[PDB]
Ligand binder design. Structure first.
Ligand SMILES: NCCOC(=O)Cc1cccc2ccccc12
Ligand SMILES: NCCOC(=O)Cc1cccc2ccccc12
Ligand SMILES: NCCOC(=O)Cc1cccc2ccccc12
Ligand SMILES: NCCOC(=O)Cc1cccc2ccccc12
Lengths: 99, 99
């Protein structure tokens, strides 16, 4: 797709057998989502840094589907106030900024 | 240009007769930059909301040049820890997300 930015670029994502909504956020390095169960061995990760950090669970090699494009990569899971698709998974689906 | 997202999409911007570096941040609604002098009548604006707010000066109809594309729009100026080009000015230069 080609997505304009008049409004927030919210998309529905397929992940862990469930549907969530997430923001395509080029300003985010990583992908962070609300609590859910995913497969694999996870380890804690401290994220943020500007004003403090929050702890999330890092799950690697997770499969996601965005707008019907599949990708594999790291998903951070925990109390995020905002579900974001970050650059790590944007690259995987071949998403670029164009003007 | 077409910008991939392996790395942070930092660009040099021309604004207020000066050069700054800013991040193209589709996750940001507004454009927020470090202290500088701009023309016009400004009014204070509280931004953020998640954990608190910071106060910035809102300058409207400011001219900016990004990667050699010019645009006019609102620039928020103040103590931001991160210079970001938000969706308000991304739309102006015709920037889209593509995959
Ligand atoms: N556009 C990059 C900034 O966008 C984010 O950083 C998303 C996000 C991810 C994890 C925690 C957060 C907490 C507060 C506010 C945004 C947060
Ligand atoms: N007064 C505490 C507010 O401080 C924070 O909220 C830090 C923080 C922690 C995790 C993720 C973030 C994302 C964006 C911006 C700040 C973030
Ligand atoms: N990707 C959207 C989240 O990106 C931002 O929100 C940029 C930004 C703008 C103003 C103040 C901030 C304070 C802390 C952390 C990021 C901030
Ligand atoms: N403990 C205070 C940390 O709380 C904040 O830092 C709130 C805040 C204010 C302005 C801009 C933001 C942008 C992203 C994330 C939080 C932001």
């Amino acid at each position: 797709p080609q997505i304009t930015l008049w409004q927030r670029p919210l998309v529905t994502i397929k992940i862990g057998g469930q549907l969530k909504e997430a923001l395509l956020d080029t300003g985010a390095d990583d992908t962070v989502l609300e609590e859910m169960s995913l497969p694999g061995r996870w380890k804690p990760k401290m994220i943020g840094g500007i004003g403090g950090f929050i702890k999330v669970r890092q799950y690697d090699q997770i499969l996601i589907e965005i707008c019907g494009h599949k990708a594999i990569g790291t998903v951070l899971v925990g109390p995020t106030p905002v579900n974001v698709i970050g650059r790590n998974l944007l690259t995987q689906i071949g998403c670029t900024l164009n003007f």
